[PDB]
Amino acid sequence: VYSSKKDRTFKVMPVPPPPPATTAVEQRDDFADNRGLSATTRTLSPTFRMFALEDGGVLVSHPSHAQIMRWNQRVHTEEGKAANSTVMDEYVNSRIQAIIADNTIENTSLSQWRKAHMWNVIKSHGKLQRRWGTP
Amino acid sequence: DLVGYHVHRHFPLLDVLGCDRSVNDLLAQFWNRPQREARTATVLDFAATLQRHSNEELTRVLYELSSLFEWDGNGLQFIAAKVLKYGRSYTVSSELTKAFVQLVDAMTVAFVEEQPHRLAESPALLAQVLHFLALVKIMEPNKWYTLNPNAPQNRADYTHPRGVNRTCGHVTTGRALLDFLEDMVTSFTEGWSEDDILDVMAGFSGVMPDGKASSPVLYALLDELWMRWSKVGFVLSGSEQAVRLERLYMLLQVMDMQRDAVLDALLGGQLRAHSTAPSTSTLPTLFCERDDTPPLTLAQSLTQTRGPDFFSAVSRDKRAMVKAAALRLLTASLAKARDDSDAVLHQALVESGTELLQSLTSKSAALSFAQREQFDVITLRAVPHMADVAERLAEQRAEAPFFPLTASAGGLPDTAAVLAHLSSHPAPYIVLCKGRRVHPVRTLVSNLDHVAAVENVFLLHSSGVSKCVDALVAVARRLRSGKDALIVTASCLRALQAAAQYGATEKRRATADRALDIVSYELEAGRAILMPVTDELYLHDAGTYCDEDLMLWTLAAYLARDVPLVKVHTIMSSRSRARNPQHALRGEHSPLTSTDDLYNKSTPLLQALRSKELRAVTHHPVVQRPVRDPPQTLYNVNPIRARFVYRRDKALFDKYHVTARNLAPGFSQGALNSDLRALGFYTPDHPQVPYTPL
Amino acid sequence: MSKQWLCREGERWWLLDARGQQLPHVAKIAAQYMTGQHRPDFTPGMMTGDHVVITNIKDAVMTGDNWIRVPITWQTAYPGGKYRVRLSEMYERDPCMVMWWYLKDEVNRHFVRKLKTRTAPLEKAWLYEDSVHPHAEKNPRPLVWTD
Amino acid sequence: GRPPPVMGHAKRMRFAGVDDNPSVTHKPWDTSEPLMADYGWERGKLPKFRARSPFHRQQIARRMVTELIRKDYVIVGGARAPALRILADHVVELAKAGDTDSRQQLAYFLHDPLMVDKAFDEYPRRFRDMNAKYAMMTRLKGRR
Amino acid sequence: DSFKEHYHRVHLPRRLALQRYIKREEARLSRHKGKAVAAAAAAGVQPGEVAYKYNRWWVSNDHEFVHQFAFVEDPDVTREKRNTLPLVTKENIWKEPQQTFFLPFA
Amino acid sequence: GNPVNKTWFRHNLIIRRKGSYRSRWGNGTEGYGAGVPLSDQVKLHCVDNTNCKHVRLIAKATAERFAHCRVFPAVAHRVSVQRFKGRVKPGNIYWVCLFTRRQTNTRMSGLQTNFDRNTCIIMNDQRVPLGTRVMYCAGRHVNHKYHLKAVVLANFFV
Amino acid sequence: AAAAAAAAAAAAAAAAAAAAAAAAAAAAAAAAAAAAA
Amino acid sequence: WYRCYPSLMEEKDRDMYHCYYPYLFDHGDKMSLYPKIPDNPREWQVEQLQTTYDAIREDKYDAFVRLRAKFPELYQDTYAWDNPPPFGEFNMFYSVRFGMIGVKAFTCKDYDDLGNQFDCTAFWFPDNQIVKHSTRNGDVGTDKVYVGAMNVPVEFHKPHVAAFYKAAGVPVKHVSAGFPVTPDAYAPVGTKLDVRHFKPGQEVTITFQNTDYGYQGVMFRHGFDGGYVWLGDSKWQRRPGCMGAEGQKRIYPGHRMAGQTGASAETYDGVPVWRIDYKNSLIYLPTLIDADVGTYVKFRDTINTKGYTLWNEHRGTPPFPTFIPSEEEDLSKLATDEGQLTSPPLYMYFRDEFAA
Amino acid sequence: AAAAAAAAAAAAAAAAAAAAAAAAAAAAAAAAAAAAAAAAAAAAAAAAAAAAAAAAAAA
Amino acid sequence: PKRKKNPMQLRRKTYGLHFKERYLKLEEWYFCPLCAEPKKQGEWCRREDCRQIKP
RNA sequence: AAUUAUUAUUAUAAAUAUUAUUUUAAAAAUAUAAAAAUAAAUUAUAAC
RNA sequence: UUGUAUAUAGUUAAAAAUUAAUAUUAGUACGCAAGGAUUCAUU
């Protein structure tokens, strides 16, 4: 198939398993015209609500990117509202807020700030220190 | 005298030499003799006596050795040589690197196994072991062997069974101890005051390779800083207790812990307000972590006019209201400071302030506040030899007389070629000050016409003027070709003033003076070009913290697009991690960012860090090193001369015979640089001379 | 290792409990996550990877006698150096050496050409033969997947 | 084991060790005597400079010596110096002997029967109170 | 970089920080046991101990004796060894040569 | 294919010891394992009273010495008399109980030894000698029950 | 000579070396009755 | 190597019905003879007798323990089951002492009572001392003990190595190598080691840098008559027929051309000690080594040999940690002809003749 | 050597007998041979079917 | 030879130490405190002073 | 003899001229050349 | 030489030959100032 040497072009992964039927409205079939093959029913699928335009298209009304980054941060933070805290947890919900507000991606880096401000963090023999106002 | 230690108790069975020197007399020897061979026989002579010394002496000698270290980079980097047996090179750690790996190996036995009671008692000791264990980057031993950050060695990390890297194999120095210190912070701290709960929280962040601090470690003190507060009821208003919040908020910014409540109070409670009286909008201020952090306000007290720690901290918070909320607290802090008439609070609040403005999206509101507060004036007053120019750059009108500064959509200074119009006025030459300091200071925006007529404009970086000034000095000469140029920034100046006084060794601080003598006395002569704070705000992209490591680059990415005819060079050391802004310093990966990011007019100037093109158009010439003359190695050990210290030589001399010509007594192999006498050794059957200088 | 084309900046830490799952298949899903193919921003130059923590290795499965009749063969340089070793023979030595070998079969599949792309995705999997693993502080989120 | 781990026939090295053992195949001449004539690399020998033959090695050595007895200095090159300072003392260990055979031991070596007298005239009165290492060997900073 | 040679320029520093994490995860569990009920199961002897093995004398399928050797090292003895002085050797231990020719069971 | 080896049979009946500065024969005079086990037709002298030439007896086997163990060699030997009496023939194959050899064979007590001429005595298939009397001094290595219980153990050994 | 019974190698350690010479219509495409290591 | 295998025994066959003594199940608080009964009775599987009291397991065991408390001598060999040996105290199967650094002094020849003649090599053990102990991250059995030798002025070593001896306080030594000891064989740093550490009959291993030969050909390095095949797996024709064969196309690894010839680290691993001179700190070994005089040779013990431990029940047992002398034992009081400790005969019979 | 490597005179895997002729991979490196049924030198050692057991008669 | 050598391959010779230890090495020296010229330690002048004492 | 090169270009005459070119401080193979043994000069020797 | 058979095993040891470990430190002489001593007396 197409230069039989070997095929290393990235192949598509098989389709995830559909959700349980739980309805008996023919949620089983594939060669049935009452629905397409894809079965996406996620946590926040019912917020993507659609209105039938007159031309033939649909006007899907969905929540804004600055809202699902709010919904997620809510979910991610009240994992435990008084429970354990993970280094990976804080660093994630530190970005979900930074994504919540004006999500242009910083253009430079995410750690150049810390790397330069580790002299008021670290105590290093105050004769060789870094006080904002150098005496 | 050859006194100081005493042989072990049971002599004919154990001949080990004890220690009986006073900690002072070890420090005096540590200081008066800074050579490596004496600075080893002090660390080792001290680490043997680490189990007798008092909790206070443990505080001193630890806090003392840090004078030899530096927060910046490679911790134990005392290398001996870069051997070239094979093609590439490898690095050999000197006897002084193996002396701290030995010292830290004696701290992890005294404090972990044989005396686990030693560190709970004196709380200021652990708060010094931690900070020491951070300066010696023991979470990353690879840099004790790494010279060029771009060339990371794996000498202390990677071994092969063929028999390479065996003795310096996998190094685990304090990973035993560094993880016992955290078993002591969780579950005691009753005898810890808030000044140390903070510092201990600052130890476990710094020592980690990136500043994360293993949150259960941190969270065990935050859980203890609330109990220190609950007895006052979260209404703290001691003015120094209102500082320990500005530090608790700078930390938990390096860590990146995002707790609004400490900002819900340090700011004054403006958030948790502007969250009342909503018609229809979000409730961003809360981001509630109520079950974790306590409700906190300060009082009807000061609640305003913060300190520098707070402003460099609120930079990281991307929230639109918090900046306008913190833009008055910078006015008030610049009001109270000016009226108080203090210098240190007046510079500290500005260099920590620009970091705040450098984050707002509105570059105009950012540029308005920069001139109403004389930022180009107060900043430069500090820098050692800048006070002369700050006067002139603060001429009564043209300090910053509302230059055209025509910013277009996206914030990029699209004024280029439409500020080259200048409004047709030629940015006048000589002005006043009859002493013929009359040539006016060359602010970039006023002199962008010159950079166009320039043949090859230069950019300075604080490294190229460190380790020597013989490379800038040359460019100081070429300034008077008319064709060339030189651009220093108010950031590169400030970032030189740090290493001008806060330098590891005087041989380096002496440079940053002679490295700032020229640039401050080549700017006053109207040769160089100072990009001031008013223009570092102009060029930088809104929202990004652009320190001197990126002002060197966003300038070379601005003018490699908005004036493409002229060259650009970078006076820096080949060891700077900013020699490759693509490898380091690159942004988060994104599908929209192209390789055409540099020339497109709609993209921010730092979008070009995701390209090897920016490094391609900006050249990096080593203008001129000092001469390649070899240093006097006649006084160092020589594998060839070593065979001659004891070589019988009777038939060599005839009349003037000496006792033993080659053997320098007391030294190692006649090497007058490798001095060993009066340092603690043991040889009960061979003589030794006492110390004398040379 | 900073080295543009690395992208340690948007990392997610997965966790693939290998218990009861087939070893020639846990090596497949974990590769789509280390090579970063599950990402809609995947461009082959960038090695945008997401650390996987495949705990509970010793509970892997091999359909049929494929524990006894599948060789890990490698031919060294010495003449007469051809080595044949079953899975039940390398499982004596180190159980993670059979999973790290089945990963090497999957990362190679798309990245054999260049050394920087052959090996770098391999350093993203942390093969732990049981529950214990030092990455409690990395919050390994248990990735959902049905073979 | 009982035989040495290396047999009689094996060349050790230059700058090797002593490696003592029992052996029975040595001592060609009256070794160690003021004219030993042995020449090699292992320490108990004189350094064998580059000559065209062992005979021609002696002829060199003879005329290098009878130029140190006219002009008490010499500027030799390479391995002729060590093997002349060694031979310069042998002549003087042979001067103090003074027996009726020494002058017939030294008349055989030197190409000159005059210098032998000068050798036997000065060196007793001159090197009487010097134990050994009579000749100096200064290495010049130049090079041919 | 042989496969079995790259698997170890990667995992050897991990195998370090793994087992040394378990040892830490023991002191937390042993200290928790110390505060927990003292005399209980708590998964063997909790205080840094290795339950002595009683079952090490076997008679294998070929009806002959087979012993399992197992030795432990108390971190105190090996720490007293390294700072105290051993005892004087008995005059009969060095004056009696280690005889050659290992006697049979004759 | 792969001419793995020619003759291949000398290596089954010779004592071949490489020369590699460690494996090496030596002239004797060093220690046990003297060297040179005398492997060819060597024309040993006969000594016992027969018509064996007593001056010539040509060798058969490719090994002869005690540090090579003449104590179990079954060393065949062919008789080649230049004259016998003008009682054995000049053409028979008798075994031999080697007595001594000119080659300086070092013993396991440092006692070097070498005689004026390498000699031996002819014996039979049952290891019994063919003579009545022996006219030479044999070597210690003739003390084995192999060549004792029929050997007269002639006279003074060494 | 007459080149018979080609062998299409797929990878290694996943082809079993008996399935290489498979995909040829013969008594192969079965399980090797007596394998040697 | 045949006849070097211990008694084979698997793990699936170390069950209750095989233990020599009562098989003891563990129950948390204490051992017991019965399996642990799961607390949650819903776990109990069908036909799995949760034995609360079995007589046979409890009778056979009851007579067993009583017989050991009443007749100790007969049941002596069953006192390590319940009373295990303590730590230290020189377990014979486990403890490995350390050796010492000796210097090749000279050679000579010695003779036993029998007429044998040995080729002796006098090794001088000048000033040995344990200079430090080290363990790989506190792992098990990875212990080491470094032993210096030949105290030297500080003006001798390079700084970066003298600075190491200026750490542990020991006298600055000439050289120090390390031996892997068991944690019971330790000794505090600085223990002045005597030569009597070795016993005059034990088989002692040495290691040294044999004499340098430079660069020799094949006739000297591997000098042979003919060989070089190791053809091995590569095919070849015998019995013609289906024949296409492969041959060599590269110098396969491990050939035998010219090379360095001997500056390596030799190792004799069976040399028995001959004469311990404990006044002059000399040891004689009845072998000639191919090493230059003055070399350093690290001495160890042949832990086992021919199948029997060296320090076993029958033959002697060493001075285990080390050899510590007395308080009044002043070696300088006695002449070198008194501080000698010869060896038993290494040969059963005079080796000029044959076995009687 | 546990890892192994003691390969035979060539054969790797031999399939079922199917009467007088039994197959065999003869993996080595190539072939050449013949064939009683149609005699043509037949490189293809990857598969050689011997006769009763005589390696002399093939395919 | 079997082919010609491209330039990146004639420079390959200059990587190892046997090339740098033969051409690109500078000797430590010093002025003889009497002979006034540079010198290496060990090799001496001809002047009776530069030769009696050994600067 | 391509030469300032393996060379007494010798038809003749001859017999005590010191009668005026030969580098190098290592190791192997090789190349010349070399004490001892299965009445003569020989061996082979791939041995110092 | 005992088991087994009319003659004699079967086991184990003594004797016939050399043992081997890779990579963290400053360099353009002889790695000997040489005649095996890390200056044997001073010149």
UniProtKB/TrEMBL annotation, chain B:
Return the protein name. Answer: Uncharacterized protein
Q: Provide the organism lineage as a comma list.
A: Eukaryota, Discoba, Euglenozoa, Kinetoplastea, Metakinetoplastina
Report the domain of life of the source organism. Eukaryota
- In residue numbers, the region (Disordered) covers 577-597
Q: Which organism is it from?
A: Leishmania major
What part of the full protein is here? 155 to 877 of 893
UniProtKB/TrEMBL annotation, chain D:
Report which part of the complete sequence is shown: 10 to 153 of 305
The name of this protein is Putative 50S ribosomal protein L17
Q: Which organism is it from?
A: Leishmania major
Similarity remark: Belongs to the bacterial ribosomal protein bL17 family.
From TrEMBL, chain E:
Instruction: Name the source's superkingdom.
Output: Eukaryota
According to UniProt, the name of this protein is Uncharacterized protein
Organism of origin is Leishmania major
Q: Top-down, what is the taxonomic lineage of the species of origin?
A: Eukaryota, Discoba, Euglenozoa, Kinetoplastea, Metakinetoplastina
Automatic annotation (TrEMBL), chain F:
One of the protein's GO biological processes = translation
Q: Which UniProt keywords apply?
A: Ribonucleoprotein, Ribosomal protein
Signal peptide segment: none
Disulfide pairings: 46-52
What Gene Ontology terms describe what this protein does at the molecular function level? Answer: large ribosomal subunit rRNA binding; structural constituent of ribosome
Q: Which InterPro entries match?
A: Ribosomal_uL14, Ribosomal_uL14_sf
Keyword Ribosomal protein listed: yes
Q: Does the keyword Ribosomal protein apply?
A: yes
Under the cellular component aspect of Gene Ontology, which terms does the record hold? mitochondrial large ribosomal subunit
The entry assigns this protein to a family as follows: Belongs to the universal ribosomal protein uL14 family.
Protein name from the UniProt record: Putative ribosomal protein L14
- Which species expresses this protein natively? Leishmania major
